[PDB]
Amino acid sequence: QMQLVQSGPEVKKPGTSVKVSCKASGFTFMSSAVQWVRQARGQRLEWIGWIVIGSGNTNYAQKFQERVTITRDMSTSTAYMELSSLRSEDTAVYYCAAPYCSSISCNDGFDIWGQGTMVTVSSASTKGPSVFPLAPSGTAALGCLVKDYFPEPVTVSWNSGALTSGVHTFPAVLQSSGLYSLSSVVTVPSSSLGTQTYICNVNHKPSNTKVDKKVEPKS
Amino acid sequence: EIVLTQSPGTLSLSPGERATLSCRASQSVSSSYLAWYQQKPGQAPRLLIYGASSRATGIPDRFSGSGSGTDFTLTISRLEPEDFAVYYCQHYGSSRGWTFGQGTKVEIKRTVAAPSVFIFPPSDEQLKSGTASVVCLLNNFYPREAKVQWKVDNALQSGNSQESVTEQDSKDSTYSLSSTLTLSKADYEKHKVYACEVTHQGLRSPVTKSFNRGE
Amino acid sequence: NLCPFGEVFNATRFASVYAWNRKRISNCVADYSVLYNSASFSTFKCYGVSPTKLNDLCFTNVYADSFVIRGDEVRQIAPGQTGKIADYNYKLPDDFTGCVIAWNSNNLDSKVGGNYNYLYRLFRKSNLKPFERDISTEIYQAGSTPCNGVEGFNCYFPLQSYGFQPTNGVGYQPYRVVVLSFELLHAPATVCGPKK
Ligand SMILES: *[C@@H]1O[C@H](CO)[C@@H](O)[C@H](O)[C@H]1NC(C)=O
Numbered sequence: 001q002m003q004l005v006q007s008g009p010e011v012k013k014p015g016t017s018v019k020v021s022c023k024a025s026g027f028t029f030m031s032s033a034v035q036w037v038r039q040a041r042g043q044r045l046e047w048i049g050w051i052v053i054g055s056g057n058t059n060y061a062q063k064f065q066e067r068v069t070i071t072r073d074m075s076t077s078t079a080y081m082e083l084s085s086l087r088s089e090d091t092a093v094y095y096c097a098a099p100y101c102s103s104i105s106c107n108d109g110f111d112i113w114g115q116g117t118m119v120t121v122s123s124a125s126t127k128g129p130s131v132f133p134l135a136p137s138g139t140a141a142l143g144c145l146v147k148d149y150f151p152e153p154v155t156v157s158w159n160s161g162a163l164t165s166g167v168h169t170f171p172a173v174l175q176s177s178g179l180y181s182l183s184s185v186v187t188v189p190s191s192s193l194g195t196q197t198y199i200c201n202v203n204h205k206p207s208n209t210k211v212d213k214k215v216e217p218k219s
Numbered sequence: 220e221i222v223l224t225q226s227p228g229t230l231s232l233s234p235g236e237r238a239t240l241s242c243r244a245s246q247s248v249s250s251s252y253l254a255w256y257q258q259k260p261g262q263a264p265r266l267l268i269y270g271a272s273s274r275a276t277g278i279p280d281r282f283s284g285s286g287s288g289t290d291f292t293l294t295i296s297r298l299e300p301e302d303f304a305v306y307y308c309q310h311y312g313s314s315r316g317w318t319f320g321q322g323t324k325v326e327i328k329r330t331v332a333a334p335s336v337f338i339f340p341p342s343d344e345q346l347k348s349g350t351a352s353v354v355c356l357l358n359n360f361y362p363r364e365a366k367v368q369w370k371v372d373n374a375l376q377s378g379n380s381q382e383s384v385t386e387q388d389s390k391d392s393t394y395s396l397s398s399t400l401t402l403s404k405a406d407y408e409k410h411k412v413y414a415c416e417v418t419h420q421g422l423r424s425p426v427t428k429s430f431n432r433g434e
Numbered sequence: 435n436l437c438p439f440g441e442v443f444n445a446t447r448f449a450s451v452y453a454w455n456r457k458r459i460s461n462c463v464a465d466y467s468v469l470y471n472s473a474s475f476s477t478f479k480c481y482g483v484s485p486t487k488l489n490d491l492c493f494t495n496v497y498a499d500s501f502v503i504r505g506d507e508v509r510q511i512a513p514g515q516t517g518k519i520a521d522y523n524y525k526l527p528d529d530f531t532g533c534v535i536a537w538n539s540n541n542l543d544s545k546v547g548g549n550y551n552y553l554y555r556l557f558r559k560s561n562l563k564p565f566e567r568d569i570s571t572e573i574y575q576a577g578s579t580p581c582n583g584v585e586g587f588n589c590y591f592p593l594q595s596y597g598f599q600p601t602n603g604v605g606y607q608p609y610r611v612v613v614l615s616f617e618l619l620h621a622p623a624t625v626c627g628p629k630k
Contacts (some may be wrong), residue, residue, distance in 0.1 A: 052590055138423075
């Protein structure tokens with residue numbers, strides 16, 4: 001009980017709109033209120049607006065007054081946030097939040113949070129990555145370059161998960177082409193290079209791409 | 220328009236130490252509508268304090284809220300390993316204009332550690348398709364601030380490069396950074412020396428890793 | 435002496451449902467059958483008494499309650515109903531002995547921009563007792579934090595406006611309501627029909 005469940009992730013093209021749902025259960029939704037907050041990756045929390053469930057009265061941050069709408073459906077105990085004219089800067093995780101309420105009283109803060117909804121605004125199409133070896137020359141470094149995929153995310157493992165220590169898989173960077181690119185590296189003893197196999201396992205679900213790249217030492 | 224400024228930007232402490240986070244408002248606001256949130260790297264925000272001083276249900280006793288007017292404080296009496304995260308304050312007074320602070324990161328304090336610098340030439344596989352990505356790795360360094368400078372034929376190369384940093388490691392509390400210089404194959408073959416120049420507090424002198432193309 | 439129902443029914447302006455008016459009918463007579471068989475009203479349901487028998491009967495007092503609601507809320511003006519109007523604005527008892535009369539008021543209570551002057555109570559700490567009027571405007575305290583007259587989080591103005599516009603549908607159109615209640619006590623009967 002006591003939760004807000006949000007709709008699934010969204011990939012939207014510029015200029016279009018997206019409508020994110022936020023379904024409440026386990027508390028007296030009719031007495032509560034729902035605020036909507038978003039957050040770009042590695043960035044701050046940004047307040048969008050809120051709605052009073054009982055009245056439907058809304059208040060938006062003036063940054064979004066021109067193209068956001070917050071509504072609610074009493075019958076389904078669901079709150080909605082619709083953002084129009086989507087731009088690249090709208091790519092973020094969107095959260096709804098509400099105070100727990102009983103029959104008698106509401107809590108005095110936003111203590112119930114949704115799981116978040118990823119919204120990606122881009123003109124790119126679904127594309128699997130290219131997987132390129134980062135070849136090693138006491139401790140050697142090697143890795144894999146996972147280049148030009150869309151959308152997020154990709155998973156990288158080394159030797160089907162048997163190699164976990166010393167593995168660094170970096171956050172993806174968005175290139176101007178609209179595609180993502182990341183690298184996964186691992187440090188190993190340089191005596192290992194001649195007698196041990198090093199394979200990176202890249203999976204990109206949206207394109208159903210699964211790759212095993214053997215990274216060998218070059219002379 | 221009420222603005223919330225959190226300080227410091229980063230808090231570098233050890234488990235068991237006392238943490239004192241600050242949230243300042245551009246005007247006086249009601250204590251009844253100032254809240255503190257915790258956010259672990261992958262999860263959603265979690266309410267810690269409401270009404271400036273009230274613990275939310277289930278929050279450990281070590282979290283404490285105080286302050287009034289324009290100065291608000293979140294205290295963690297003795298930090299546990301799970302407490303190292305990012306903390307936001309929020310003002311939700313009146314009906315409009317609610318704002319968040321920019322957030323304070325509570326990171327694990329550590330000895331200064333120079334980065335291990337590796338450089339990777341573009342693979343033959345990538346070069347076959349017309350693009351050259353040179354990767355320079357900075358491994359296991361602390362603190363997080365670092366400077367990576369690309370040098371191409373002994374000239375400082377600006378543009379065509381992007382950085383990405385891992386999160387603080389659970390075990391050794393270090394960071395790692397990857398810089399990628401991406402050029403077309405035609406431009407890549409117009410130069411010979413490709414170098415990566417790293418500046419960090421753990422290194423007295425900038426460490427350079429380089430290679431000559433195809434050599 | 436004829437009972438002055440025209441003052442109630444044909445009043446130029448009507449009260450908001452939260453501030454529902456109540457006019458007393460002391461000593462006079464009237465033909466309820468003329469009001470019953472009138473085509474001006476879309477609803478004319480009586481309770482505890484027959485609408486046709488009212489002409490032969492006499493009561494100590496009669497009350498005329500008038501207000502304005504939306505079309506789909508007229509059903510709440512009945513004994514044993516629930517909803518925003520029945521719970522927070524106008525509540526009829528279970529042993530109601532009277533008649534509920536209502537008609538469409540779109541030609542009057544709807545403006546080109548939208549008449550926002552008719553309101554209803556949205557929030558209340560408890561339900562009204564039958565025949566109870568609440569016209570207070572205290573900020574509704576949804577949580578444990580006092581509002582001190584300020585609206586905001588967990589602090590809501592208790593009244594809400596009807597969006598009465600001409601482009602609305604029959605349900606979302608204003609309907610003027612008149613509720614007559616008949617009481618007989620130890621005092622002599624007073625308000626009468628022509629038969630007695
Ligand atoms: C009210 O006005 C109507 C005409 O619209 C009229 O027929 C009627 O006699 C008036 N009085 C009452 C009590 O209905």
